[PDB]
Amino acid sequence: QLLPAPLTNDPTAIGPVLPFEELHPRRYPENTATFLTRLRSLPSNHLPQPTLNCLLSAVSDQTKVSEEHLWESLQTILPDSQLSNEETNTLGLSTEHLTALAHLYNFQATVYSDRGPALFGPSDTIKRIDITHTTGPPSHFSPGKRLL
């Protein structure tokens, strides 16, 4: 709820801090796209791929979109401060990045977490994907449903 200083300082973005779903309206599942962001305005700086890339690997497997294209797409929609920071370098990408990808590639994901399944991404979409998440630690995303 409080305004994050790196976001308001981020010169890749413009305008006010607002929930993702206010800036990028879609039919998101409740309480998944409420996270604060700003409109991304500057073109891509071509950030290196994240070291903890398992979310990209998982979505890539399920969509047949390369991890590079997924990552460049994230740089079209999110400010850089929300893509490369202490959290993403130590914990990886999150379900908030999944929501952003789901808007950018028009899919809804079922995430099979340790606490059960949950929907991420707009419902006004045709494509459906399955993602597995384990809390660990470390947090790990994998493609498909929880087997074994």
Author numbering: 730 to 877
Paper text:
We also reported that the TYMV papain-like cysteine PRO domain involved in the proteolytic processing of the viral replication precursor protein, also displays a DUB activity that was able to rescue the viral polymerase from degradation. The structure of the recombinant TYMV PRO/DUB domain we solved previously (residues 728–879 of the TYMV replication precursor protein) highlighted its homology with members of the ovarian tumor domain-containing (OTU) superfamily of DUBs.
Given the two similar classes (mild or severe) of DUB activity impairment, whether in loop mutants or distant patch mutants, we also examined the structure of the TYMV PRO/DUB I847A point mutant (hereafter 'I847A'), crystals of which were actually obtained first, and from which we seeded the ΔC5 crystals. The seeding procedure led to the same crystal form, and the I847A crystal is essentially identical to the ΔC5 crystal. The only difference in packing between the ΔC5 and I847A crystals is a slight shift of molecule 'B' with respect to molecule 'A'. Residues 730–877 are ordered in I847A molecule 'A' and residues 732–876 in I847A molecule 'B'. The two I847A molecules appear superimposable to their counterparts in the ΔC5 crystal, with root-mean-square deviation of 0.09 Å for the 143 Cα carbons present and ordered in both 'A' molecules, and 0.23 Å for 141 Cα carbons present and ordered in both 'B' molecules. Importantly, loops 864–868 thus occupy the same positions in the I847A and ΔC5 crystals, i.e. intermediate in 'A' and zipped up in 'B'. The fact that the two mutants I847A and ΔC5 display identical conformations in the same crystal packing environments shows that the mutations themselves have altered neither the overall structure of the molecule, nor the conformation of loop 864–868. Thus, the mobility and zippering of loop 864–868, and the associated changes in the active site conformations as compared to the WT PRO:PRO complex, are properties of the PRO/DUB framework and reflect available conformations of this mobile loop. Additionally, the structure of the I847A mutant confirms that the mutation indeed reduces the hydrophobic surface of the distant patch (black patches in Fig 3). Mutation of these distant patches has allowed the selective disruption of DUB activity in viral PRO/DUB enzymes from EAV, SARS-CoV and MERS-CoV. Such a strategy also proved successful in the case of TYMV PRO/DUB, as we show here that mutants of the distant patch centered on I847 are indeed selectively defective in DUB activity.
